[PDB]
Design an enzyme around this catalytic site. Structure first.
Site, PDB file in Angstrom:
ATOM      1  CG  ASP A  15      -2.258   0.922   3.339  1.00 27.37           C
ATOM      2  OD1 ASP A  15      -1.110   1.149   2.836  1.00 27.37           O
ATOM      3  OD2 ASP A  15      -2.472   0.021   4.186  1.00 27.37           O
ATOM      4  NE  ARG A  72       1.044  -2.437   2.203  1.00 24.73           N
ATOM      5  CZ  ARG A  72       1.976  -1.536   1.911  1.00 24.73           C
ATOM      6  NH1 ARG A  72       3.152  -1.918   1.425  1.00 24.73           N
ATOM      7  NH2 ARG A  72       1.750  -0.248   2.124  1.00 24.73           N
ATOM      8  CG  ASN A  73      -3.680  -2.840   1.233  1.00 23.09           C
ATOM      9  OD1 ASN A  73      -3.987  -3.737   2.020  1.00 23.09           O
ATOM     10  ND2 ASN A  73      -2.895  -1.854   1.598  1.00 23.09           N
ATOM     11  CG  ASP A  93      -7.313  -0.613   3.672  1.00 21.97           C
ATOM     12  OD1 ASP A  93      -6.114  -0.924   3.806  1.00 21.97           O
ATOM     13  OD2 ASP A  93      -7.800   0.409   4.168  1.00 21.97           O
TER      14      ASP A  93
END
Ligand code: 0LI
Length: 273
Positions: free
Chosen positions: A139, A143-144, A157
């Protein structure tokens, strides 16, 4: 739950604060190491209606973080409260939020070209470390990525292809074709994700394929479609993005190669604009 003395922090040392976004809260830890000092931390705990699997998922997440080890460019585990109460997983606090938010707030109505390349170098360095630890992210996206008070990038994460993020973005937009269609996850599929993250950095928090639904994204991927070159992005950095998005996974650069190239680019990128 057995008490792990390498990580255990007594509950009376953790002063719980405002929520940051199970659920994550800001907190103050008294004497994580001298014993008379407070350290601002982020704490993950289960929501009020958490299931037995939600609990097992938090345990396994904590156990994995214990094995990865410390790195400047990953959100590092600092402690845990496992005895006589709810499970708390304690990590470093990143005061300037996620990289998508960090970038959007610094758009013109500030970051130089060198700072943006440095951001990409730091994320690549964190990814190279995770890969050396035999880890696959799955992922990777802005945003992570978390940003501390001192502007250090830290990888973090926080499946249904149609489910959107809080911002209204589709996670399928960061996924390599083979991860998406063939469920094959590797460092090579993460390098594809890193290419989308570079695009996010150079558009200062721009949204990939805005207004493109899942079925249409699948069609774009099958046709070998690639995102346009952002404005204020060199030919060399766009070729890096395109190489990350090679249709043949073995032909994509590795994170080790990306760190070397980004290191060289940082040094030649001016901070004058
Ligand atoms: C409380 C908390 C708990 C856990 C984690 C967390 O990131 N866990 C994590 C789990 C797995 C992995 C690696 N895997 C990926 C999946 N993969 C399939 C296997 C390998 C990694 C990674 F960093 F290594 F990538 C991290 C972050 C926070 C936070 C925070 C925090 C700090 N400042 C702020 C400011 C605002 C908001 N939050 N916040």
């Amino acid at each position: 739950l057995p008490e792990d003395p390498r990580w255990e922090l007594p509950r009376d040392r953790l002063v719980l604060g405002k929520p940051l976004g199970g659920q994550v809260v800001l907190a103050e830890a008294i004497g994580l190491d001298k014993p008379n000092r407070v350290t601002k931390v982020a704490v993950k705990m289960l929501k009020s209606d958490a299931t037995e699997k939600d609990l097992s998922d938090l345990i396994s997440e904590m156990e994995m973080m214990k094995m990865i080890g410390k790195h400047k460019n990953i959100i590092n585990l600092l402690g845990a409260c496992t005895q006589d109460g709810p499970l708390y997983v304690i990590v470093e606090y990143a005061s300037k939020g996620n990289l998508r938010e960090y970038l959007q707030a610094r758009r013109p109505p500030q970051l130089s070209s060198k700072d943006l390349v440095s951001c990409a170098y730091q994320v690549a360095r964190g990814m190279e470390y995770l890969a050396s630890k035999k880890c696959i992210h799955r992922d990777l996206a802005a945003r992570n990525v978390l940003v501390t008070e001192d502007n250090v990038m830290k990888i973090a994460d926080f499946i249904d292809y149609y489910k959107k993020t809080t911002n209204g973005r589709l996670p399928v937009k960061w996924m390599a074709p083979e991860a998406l269609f063939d469920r094959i996850y590797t460092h090579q599929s993460d390098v594809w994700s890193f290419g989308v993250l570079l695009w996010e950095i150079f558009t200062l928090g721009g949204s990939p394929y805005p207004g493109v639904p899942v079925e249409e994204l699948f069609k774009l991927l099958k046709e070998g479609h690639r995102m346009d070159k952002p404005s204020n992005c060199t030919n060399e950095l766009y070729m890096m993005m395109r190489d990350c998005w090679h249709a043949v996974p073995s032909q994509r650069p590795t994170f080790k190669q990306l760190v070397e190239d980004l290191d060289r680019i940082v040094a030649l990128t001016s901070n004058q604009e």
